């Protein structure tokens, strides 16, 4: 079917050149390869944040402690003030 | 911030408060009471004591000995006007 032949193969063969051998695109006049594979190649990392979130911050935890390993002028406070609640108790 | 003690803190509480004054006065009160009556010597003489045990404890408690008192003044007094008159 000359119909169906010819119109499939001008289907396949005039988006060929932009595909196949990279010819860039006759009929378009802007270029096709410094939009995707160039420009918005960093596209989702121009969507997303870029040298934070996808570079993913392998970040150590900042280190909380004990309380300071000071168990005397407060201990001693603390039982002071604990007869002060149990005289309150 | 921690763990926060007050159960314990009883040692050192005992004291200050109320029933501890009251506490530390009845322990003291209960030792040296006498138990069931004793040491109440019910028998003692004195030449004069045995009037007392007899009459003038709280069991009688009756005022005839001043009566008989009453009647030594009449065994006196009487006697003295055999002094007198």
Do not use: C
Request: aromatic share 10%; hydrophobic share 35%.
């Amino acid at each position: 079917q000359d119909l169906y032949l010819r119109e499939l193969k001008d289907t396949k063969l005039a988006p060929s050149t932009l595909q196949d051998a990279e010819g860039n695109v006759k009929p378009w006049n802007p270029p096709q390869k410094p939009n995707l594979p160039e420009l918005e190649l960093q596209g989702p990392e121009a969507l997303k944040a870029y040298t934070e979130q996808n570079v993913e911050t392998a970040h150590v935890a900042k280190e909380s402690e004990e309380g300071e390993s000071e168990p005397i002028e407060e201990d001693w406070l603390v039982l002071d003030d604990a007869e002060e609640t149990k005289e309150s108790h | 911030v921690s763990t926060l003690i007050p159960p314990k803190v009883v040692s050192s509480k005992n004291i200050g408060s109320a029933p501890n004054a009251k506490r530390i006065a009845n322990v003291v009160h209960f030792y040296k009471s006498l138990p069931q009556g004793p040491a109440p010597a019910i028998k003692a003489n004195t030449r004069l004591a045995r009037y007392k045990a007899k009459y003038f404890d709280g069991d009688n408690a009756s005022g005839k000995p001043l009566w008989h008192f009453a009647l030594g003044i009449i065994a006196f007094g009487y006697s003295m006007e055999y002094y007198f008159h």
